[PDB]
């Protein structure tokens, strides 16, 4: 019984749906069990890598705080040395940030670095099984595993992923461009794809926020 998924939102008529092979981690040879459809406006966006470049700089430099300081002549018991703690925080436009994440998803899929999976459940929690399966499926040295929510993630995967430095497991809300670029291949659960699409596709329209959504 093939696992067939269709985009919940209306795909544009002039754009055909994107498709990929659904996989399962239950067995080594369970590479293909179904075929899924992906929204072209999410997984077939233009390859604008400068936005990805900007997002990476923003991600690294928005948390940057420098504590370097030097004393001037008036403070001596450097003419142009560091003066106290300095902040470099800045905010990119919300639409651009959403687009940057979209661009990253296309790059991984077009480059055969994205692996769509039905569920993360594993027959055993041994890290050896996970690494060997990655070798069998020719995955990259670093594999990123994403689940819908942190609370419900399978126990077996947590033990293996926690003990693996190059295989890192994150929740869906924790997904970011930096991790995707840092990790050679991305593993996404089917519910996560639907979760990601809704927020990205929700961005349509403006109805400018008169107040923060907190």
């Amino acid at each position: 019984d093939p696992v067939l998924r269709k985009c919940e939102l209306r795909i544009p008529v002039h754009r055909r749906p994107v498709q990929a092979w659904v996989e399962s981690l239950r067995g080594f040879e369970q590479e293909r069990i179904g075929l899924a459809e992906l929204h072209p406006d999410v997984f077939a966006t233009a390859p604008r890598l400068d936005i990805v470049h900007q997002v990476a700089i923003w991600q690294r430099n928005f948390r940057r705080i420098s504590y370097a300081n030097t004393k001037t002549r008036a403070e001596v018991s450097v003419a142009h040395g560091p003066r106290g703690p300095t902040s470099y925080y800045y905010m990119l436009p919300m639409k651009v940030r959403a687009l940057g994440l979209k661009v990253a998803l296309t790059v991984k899929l077009m480059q055969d670095d994205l692996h769509i999976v039905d569920s993360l459940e594993l027959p055993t929690a041994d890290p050896q099984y996970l690494t060997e399966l990655a070798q069998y499926r020719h995955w990259g040295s670093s594999v990123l595993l994403v689940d819908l929510t942190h609370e419900e993630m399978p126990k077996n995967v947590v033990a293996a992923t926690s003990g693996l430095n190059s295989f890192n497991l994150i929740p869906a809300v924790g997904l970011n461009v930096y991790s995707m670029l840092k990790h050679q291949t991305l593993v996404l659960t089917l519910p996560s794809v639907a979760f990601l699409e809704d927020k990205l596709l929700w961005q349509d329209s403006r109805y400018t926020p008169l107040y923060p959504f907190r």
Binding site: Q59, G84, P85
Partner: protein
């Protein structure tokens, strides 16, 4: 000048450690969290510059207001004197 006659000790850096590997996670809390928490809320550092940025004078002024009631008398007086010199340069020259 004269230079070291020996090499510095070798340094080994792990690029896949938990800190580097997981750096940036949850930076999309706003978009992926319904915007309930703004990413500026994730800034960790001095209280007077969490979610805010400005020039040194603004940073110093904000620092004074935020912890002025908790500032030492010696520190507060020194900060006031430094601010006085800074104020004249920026606001008169």
């Amino acid at each position: 000048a004269f230079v070291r006659l020996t090499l510095p000790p070798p340094k080994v850096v792990d690029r896949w450690n938990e800190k580097r590997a997981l750096f940036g996670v949850y930076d999309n809390i706003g978009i992926l969290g319904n915007f309930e928490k703004h990413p500026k809320e994730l800034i960790k550092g001095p209280v007077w510059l969490r979610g805010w940025r400005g020039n040194e004078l603004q940073r110093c002024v904000r620092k004074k207001k935020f912890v002025g009631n908790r500032m030492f008398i010696e520190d507060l007086h020194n900060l006031n004197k430094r601010i006085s010199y800074l104020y004249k340069h920026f606001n008169r020259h």
